[PDB]
């Protein structure tokens, strides 16, 4: 009888369930009085509805989802904000957890970028204690592939703050005013999701003359510049716009509260090649000893992005050969493969 009882009791809830009706899910959009709202069904007319007596008058603020009754059209209970990956914004792109230690040979540069970006977000007291508005924005310039993005990605991982990555060159679309609009949606997106490191990729495109299209670049800079030092809201989000060419960038863009700190990140540090390989080499099993030093000179002017491949490409050499890397002979050719074939 005990087995029959637990199933029978669940069945009794189901008999009640058959009775229960559905609520037309909708969103509130105004509050005319203390008993009247203007609710919109998800794909439905806008009904003027009241709220059930056992509801919080307040909690129902514009934007607050509700599920009104299907006949009374009186709201019966709030609901959480709908969550779907319908977002068009990289914002959800988790940086992923990357420790500062993983970027290699940028101790000073990483230290600086920590200052401007990390500080205003974590210990604002220091800035408000001295009375200066928190610094906002870091301009990371350096040779391509050196790893500007990663440092900007680790900073997000330490702070646990949402990161939005914009390929700046892409934002400059051909049709007029699209280019300003993409920048505008970025900062407007930030207001909704705080705090977000807005990492702009090569910024030479938008910042740095007589043609219709030669002033669209001019307009887009003005939109970028305004959204920073701009009436609206000053905000708490930070931007890490990184370029490859710092002479091109316009003067206004490099200012105290409008993007400061020209952190230079040159090709992997001489010693870094070790650290970078150290941080990027060890993962792959490789019992054999390493003459890293020769790999260092075997890899002069290496982009660092190449160094990541060096070890990985070596793994493919190992993926053929056998299954365990036991020889530096591998990195040598791997260094070549990540040089002549990386040209």
């Amino acid at each position: 009888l005990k087995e029959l009882t637990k199933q029978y009791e669940k069945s009794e809830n189901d008999l009640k369930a058959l009775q229960s009706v559905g609520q037309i899910v909708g969103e509130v959009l105004k509050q005319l009085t203390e008993e009247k709202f203007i609710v919109k069904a998800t794909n439905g007319p806008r009904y003027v509805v009241g709220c059930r007596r056992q509801l919080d008058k307040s909690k129902l603020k514009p934007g607050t989802r509700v599920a009104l009754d299907m006949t009374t059209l009186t709201i019966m209970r709030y609901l959480p904000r709908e969550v779907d990956p319908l977002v068009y914004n990289m914002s959800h792109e988790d940086p992923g957890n990357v420790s500062y230690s993983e970027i290699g040979g940028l101790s000073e540069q990483i230290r600086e970028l920590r200052e401007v970006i990390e500080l205003p977000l974590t210990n604002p007291e220091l800035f408000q204690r001295v009375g200066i508005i928190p610094p906002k924005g870091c301009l990371l310039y350096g040779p391509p592939g050196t790893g500007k993005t990663l440092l900007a990605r680790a900073v997000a991982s330490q702070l646990d703050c949402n990161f939005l990555k914009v390929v700046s060159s892409s934002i400059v679309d051909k049709y007029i005013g699209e280019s300003a609009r993409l920048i505008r949606e970025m900062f407007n997106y930030a207001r909704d999701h705080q705090p977000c490191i807005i990492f702009m990729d090569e910024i030479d495109a938008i910042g740095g003359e007589g043609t219709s299209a030669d002033r669209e670049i001019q307009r887009t800079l003005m939109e970028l510049l305004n959204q920073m030092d701009g009436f609206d809201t000053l905000h708490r989000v930070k931007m890490i716009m990184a370029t490859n060419r710092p002479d091109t960038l316009d003067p206004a863009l490099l200012r105290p509260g409008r993007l400061d700190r020209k952190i230079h990140i040159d090709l992997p540090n001489e010693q870094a090649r070790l650290d970078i390989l150290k941080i990027h080499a060890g993962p792959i099993t490789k019992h054999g000893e390493i003459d890293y030093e020769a790999i260092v000179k075997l890899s002069d002017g290496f982009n660092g992005a190449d160094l990541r491949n060096v070890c990985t490409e070596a793994g493919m050499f190992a993926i053929r050969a056998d299954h365990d890397f036991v020889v530096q002979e591998d990195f040598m050719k791997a260094v070549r493969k990540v040089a002549d074939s990386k040209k």
């Binding site: 990289m90 792109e93 992923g96 390929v167 892409s170």
Partner: protein, 143 residues
Amino acid sequence: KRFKAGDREVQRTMLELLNQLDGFQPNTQVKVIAATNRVDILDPALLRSGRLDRKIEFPMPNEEARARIMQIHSRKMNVSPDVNYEELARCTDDFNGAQCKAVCVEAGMIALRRGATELTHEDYMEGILEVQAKKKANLQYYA
């Protein structure tokens, strides 16, 4: 890429596919491969970290490749044993592989109109003119 327009249905299809691709981790036997002829219009989201990131590059074939490519699509035909496929490649430039097949198919046809069985070298060359719509006329000032 992206764009209330009527493209908010395909946008759901992409994000759905975007969703699952990141849903499953590597180490699995669900290796994915996708093909596109215009990679300048694809979303950056589609190619970021856990999505099609190692991107395969398909070039327009080189001259040696064209000589080979024009061979594979000619095996099932009775091409004459003296057809310097190499020489054909030299005359066949800026040719996508498919067009490199078009010469083979056109080569067989051109033989047909001439009532031959084996495709001579000339038939192949006439294809290299009719694959690109050109009409070879013996201009006079050459001699």
